[model samples]
Target: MSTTAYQPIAECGATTQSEAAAYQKRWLVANDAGQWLNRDLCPRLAEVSVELRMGYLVLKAPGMLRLDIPLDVIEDDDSVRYQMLVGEQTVDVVDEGELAAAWISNHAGVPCRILKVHPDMAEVRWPSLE
Candidate 1:
């Protein structure tokens, strides 16, 4: 499976230029966890975050450590957007605001959503980035 190394906790507020830069600092990047996994059986590693917030995090394939934690720490005033790379091409993933809103309403536990992109777009045409 494709993998991403455990980076540090990135930003979670508005997707500002400064926030994005700060977030990058927390991420271990695409393959930073290779060494850590090989060093430890990684049983100690697992997903960790504030379940009260509707956020998302992902770890490497085999080790499965919690690397990215999107908490209610940031103010997502604007829609946060990013590229969803499938194979060699990329598609757009929707906002995390919906999940966040649900969390706000629940007032107890957090919820997760499968941020899906249009698979057919790959066959149609390249999309324009505004």
Candidate 2:
């Protein structure tokens, strides 16, 4: 159990209008390889997006499913292997940040790498105009 408090969206480096939109567009795709690697537990995840709210990750499928996952779970992982706490059980979530980006890219049929940008970085241009 970690005591790291969940920061506001801004501190999490999600500080832009576009970032907000993309955040809304991001969701999870659960692939139960235990049964079949090529099989999808929820194919509709290809279309629907997920939302994180109040220590819960909400996904829309046949109905709506919510999982208790806090920001510390992400902070603890830092872009990979999220520790999801469901009831008294703990499950390891894959690179959700990366997976969401990749899935969305492939679904849109576009080749791209999604990177989480920071507000400070956004202010400082890489190719300096000096």
Candidate 3:
């Protein structure tokens, strides 16, 4: 058995991009104020990617649900607004893009940029166009 205690990155310190990627196994969902978010709220979101390419934030979720949002969309001066469907319920919310980005930085663990498009055949896709 492993002796290393499981420690969240937020508890570690302000990590570089590489360090954040090292924790790719962990989810980086948190508030802008630096508070960890409840995973139960968004179980689909399994992990976040720190090494974003072409200013896109890559998100890995359950059942091969990959989300790719432009960095500009997350860094815009306007608020990030979206509606989420949780268990047959509709949820709408708005917040700053910076907080959303910071949340990823805190919770994202590994440097996973490519997501399995067809998990059944182990096929992969990068920079999702859809």
List per-candidate RMSD values in Å.
16.6, 14.9, 15.7
How does each model score on lDDT? 0.30, 0.33, 0.34
- True lDDT of residue 97, candidate 1: 46
Ranking by lDDT: 3, 2, 1
Candidate 1's residue-wise lDDT over 2-108, tens digit each?
A: 33332233212123233233333222111121111111222222222311223434322232222233532445555354354433345554334454324322321
How good is model 3 by TM-score?
Answer: 0.28
Tell me which of candidates 1 and 2 scores higher on lDDT: 2
lDDT value, candidate 3, whole model: 0.34
> Judged by TM-score relative to the true structure, which candidate is superior, 2 or 3?
2
* Model 3 regions more than 4 Å off: 1-27, 30-35, 38-51, 72-76, 81-130
Q: How good is model 2 by TM-score?
A: 0.29
Q: Which candidate number maximizes lDDT?
A: 3
Worst 10 residues of 1 by lDDT: 30-39
lDDT of 2 by residue, 75-104 (tens): 553555544332323444443454444543
- Backbone clashes for every candidate come to 5, 0, 7
Q: How well does each candidate superpose onto the true structure, as a TM-score?
A: 0.22, 0.29, 0.28
Tell me the tens digit of each residue's lDDT in model 3 across 1-130.
Answer: 5433332221222323543343332323443322333334333334332234455544443233345544333434454443332233333333324534544443443221211111122222211323
Compare candidates 1 and 3 on lDDT and give the better one. 3
